[model samples]
Target: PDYKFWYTQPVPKINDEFNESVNEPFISDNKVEDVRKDEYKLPPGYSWYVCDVKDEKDRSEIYTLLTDNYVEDDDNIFRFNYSAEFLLWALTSPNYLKTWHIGVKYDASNKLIGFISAIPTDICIHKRTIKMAEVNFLCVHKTLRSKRLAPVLIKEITRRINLENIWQAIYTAGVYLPKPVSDARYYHRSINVKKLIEIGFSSLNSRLTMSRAIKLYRVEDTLNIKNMRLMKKKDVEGVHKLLGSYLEQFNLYAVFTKEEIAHWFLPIENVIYTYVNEENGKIKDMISFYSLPSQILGNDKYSTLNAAYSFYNVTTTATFKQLMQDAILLAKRNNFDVFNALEVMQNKSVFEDLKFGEGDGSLKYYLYNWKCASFAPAHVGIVLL
Candidate 1:
């Protein structure tokens, strides 16, 4: 596992020993004034641009670039299709910096071909809360893959983030980089098993017929939890307090303010869905998931697979398994083909009983310019979409 470029960065090496007590930035010499004032130079035929996600044209350009070039399934059968609305919501969270949405374009054509973005977030790592950038959406046009543009895109984002006095970042990738603070495995439950089989996303076991498989994966239309309803604006205060307290048990989790909670947990049509369990006029539990469809590249029967990814969830009156059961019911009613979740934060307790099969996909959680002891998946409470 040769990390040609990551070896030069501030992250821990693959073989670095875990420190149980140390919690600090790996590179402490950097200061805002000493950071690069000029932008990193792009290739000869390309130039850099700060993507204005508020603008329709810029947002569309970025949406198209990522929709066509971002992460894909190992078999290349499915490609992530992040819509324009989702991009806007994800990049413009509370206290988001517009300049962190970096883009690269062909100088002559003035068309977007590459992009990477960072959002303001505070993560509590081993009881220490640090202001850091959550870096994501690193994409380069397929034609430009051979030019080694990813490293430059990463370096440029690092420079921009450093100029703001932010020296740490959190990111996740399907592939291993230099090192990972934690690694989480993916587990998926089929909402529509027939569609998944036809699209090659999942298969029917040799012992079971299609009818049996469908019956096995089928979920009830109605939720079992009493008083389960969509999260409303009025529930913001209660949900925020509930989520903050629930996240405190983990070693790695996001610290969210009320505003951030409203932005992330509030329901948006086809983008985010959150529901809370209200009992006797009080909020007791909450669950949420986001919609992210994938294009079935070569499939003629179906062009998309609507996926519901489990987001922040908390349980008090209801057990974790019961809350997740309601989540599955809601997603089923919403017409999702699958429900995907990471094996983190008590999620493993329900996987087997709920009939979720483990997936080969694993997300490696990495932190730039930060070091700490290695943690198991259960210790990581933050979920990156």
Candidate 2:
């Protein structure tokens, strides 16, 4: 086999703007009335305030919602929880604007009531290509569950997605695991379950034992460094080399080439917030996040961030800590709330170390255009979705 040919064939163009267009449409008509966006009144004595989260105070409240009761439990052992600042970064980053979104909030006197969001993207999945929207974090204030606010929130998000010219949206909620949403017909890659267990992802069902405690770090002041900057168009070679040296550790084969990396990380409009860690004047690590408000046009209950792609985290141990810390600070400085470190289930420790908690939600996936997934997946696994 020509290793260079396969690796050098140029990375897959996963963005909606630059890739070959797929004509399939994502279709869905889910909505609920009685819910007004931007301004909606609750029943009589009760009231609901759903707002597009945009300020530091609002983000801090949402952080509480995310971290309350968040522990490394059995079912959620394979999850990643990023800070509210990181989420904000994803929403504000230029790389994330390609698919815009809004973070939503519904509260009654300091208590969050309901939430959900929509994002614009050209989804190539399940052999159908379409400019679709992604709806995420459909959560309702537990106290208000008796009022059936979940369906209402979901409907509002769906309606917003539709208004944006999106036909289909993807959602995966936990089923048989104590949640309103259950497992559905969502698509995904066939991963090695046994390998996952060996890698500390899945527990040994037969072992009848609990797993070790994984510490979720906030990246202390000690971890902060000053040499981080957004990755530049000219750092392609350095980024490639960094990924090359660390590929084996992450179970990856090759890194994206110059063109592919630029499309995936940079923006046609302006300088996005994809950062790089430099030492002695050389690029050593990369972290990218995006934030765009256009994706959540008609809703105020949720915001979106580019969390699925853009990770070039590589370097020495201390350098790794520096990159992560710098990324967190960058998010805070830019008024971002979440930095999506890719939720690769295989690296639970890294996430915990980075202080990200697992969202009590699951990500569903599908494959469109068999041009590649049509072939054997044994060699190539899941890519940016």
lDDT for 208 in candidate 2 is 33
Give the alpha carbon lDDT tens digit for every residue of 43-137 in model 1. Answer: 69899988999999999999999888989988788899998999888999999999999999999999999999999999999999999999999
Q: Each prediction's Cα lDDT score?
A: 0.91, 0.42
Candidate 1: which stretches are off by over 4 Å? none
Q: Give the TM-score of candidate 1.
A: 0.98
Query: What is candidate 2's lDDT per residue for 5-79, written digit by digit as tens?
Result: 222222222322222242333223434342234533345444444344467776666556644422223353332
Give per-residue lDDT, candidate 1, residue 50: 88
TM-score of every candidate: 0.98, 0.42
After TM-score superposition, the amount by which residue 167's alpha carbon in candidate 2 deviates from its true location, in angstroms, is: 1.3
Q: Kindly state the number of residue pairs that clash in model 1.
A: 0
Model 2 global lDDT (CA atoms, 0 to 1): 0.42
